[PDB]
C-alpha cells in the first residue's frame, strides 16, 4: 500500500500567509501536491507542487479572516518518459 | 516505450537564472518533471514538477560560473495518495 501523509500543522499565521508543515518518510516520495480552497464558496481549488525533499511550504497570497480547506498529497511516479539530460553553465567564471 | 521530450536548450542566461526549453508531443503528458543538480556534486538532485501545457521553465536561485545538470521527463501515470484534510482560518477580519 501507499501511505497518505501525516501531521499537517500550520506554524505562523498572518492575514496572507500560513506555513503548512508535515510528516513523511524520507526518499519514499518524489513530490508533494497541495490542494487548497476556501471552506466557504471559492470558484476553483488551487494546486501546488513541491519536491518530496521538503516537509513544509509558505502558502502565500491569502485573504484575511477566511476559512481555507487544505489538502496535501504525496506524489510517486509510475509512468515517466525517459530523461532528456543536458549540461548547461551559468554566467560568470 | 513512451516518447522522450527532445531538444533541450537554455535561453535567458544569468549567473542566478537559466531558461529551459524543449519539444514534446501535445496531448501526451499533463506534467513534466525537471530534475537538476550541480554537475559538480553527484549527491542530491532537486525535483521540480510543471504543468503539461508548458514547454519552457525558468530556473532560479543559482550559483555563478556553475555547470548544472538538468533532466526533463514526461509524466504520464501518477500514484497520488489519499488526501490529508485540514481547516485553517487566516489572521485578520
Describe it for me?
Two copies of one chain form a homodimer. Chain A is mainly β and 93 residues long. The first copy, chain A, has a single domain (1-93), classed as Immunoglobulin-like (Sandwich). Chain A contains no helices and seven strands. Chain A has strands spanning 6-9, 21-23, 31-38, 46-51, 67-70, 73-80, 84-89. In chain A, a hairpin with a 7-residue loop joins strand 3 and strand 4. The first copy, chain A, is extended. The N and C termini of chain A lie far apart (49 Å). Chains A and B meet through strand 3, strand 5, strand 6 and strand 7 of A and strand 1, strand 4, strand 6 and strand 7 of B.
Quick description:
Chain A contains no helices and seven strands. In chain A, 0% of the residues lie in helices and 42% in strands.
What are the main properties of this structure?
93 residues; extended; 0% helix; two-stranded antiparallel ribbon; Immunoglobulin-like; mainly beta; homodimer; four-stranded antiparallel sheet
What is the assigned CATH homologous superfamily of chain A? Answer: Immunoglobulins
Major pleated sheet of chain A: 4 strands, antiparallel
Backbone shape of chain A:
extended
Determine the N-to-C terminus distance of chain A. Answer: 49 Å
Helix content of chain A: under 10%
Q: Which structural class fits the helix and strand makeup of chain A?
A: mainly beta
Amino acid at each position: 500500500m501507499l501511505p497518505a501523509p501525516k501531521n499537517l500543522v500550520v506554524s505562523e499565521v498572518t492575514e496572507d500567509s500560513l506555513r503548512l508543515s508535515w510528516d513523511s518518510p524520507p526518499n519514499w516520495y518524489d513530490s508533494f501536491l497541495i490542494q487548497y480552497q476556501e471552506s466557504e464558496k471559492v470558484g476553483e481549488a488551487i494546486n501546488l507542487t513541491v519536491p518530496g525533499s521538503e516537509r513544509s511550504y509558505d502558502l502565500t497570497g491569502l485573504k484575511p479572516g477566511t476559512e481555507y480547506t487544505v489538502s496535501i498529497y504525496g506524489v510517486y511516479y509510475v509512468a515517466l518518459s525517459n530523461p532528456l539530460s543536458a549540461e548547461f553553465t551559468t554566467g560568470g567564471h
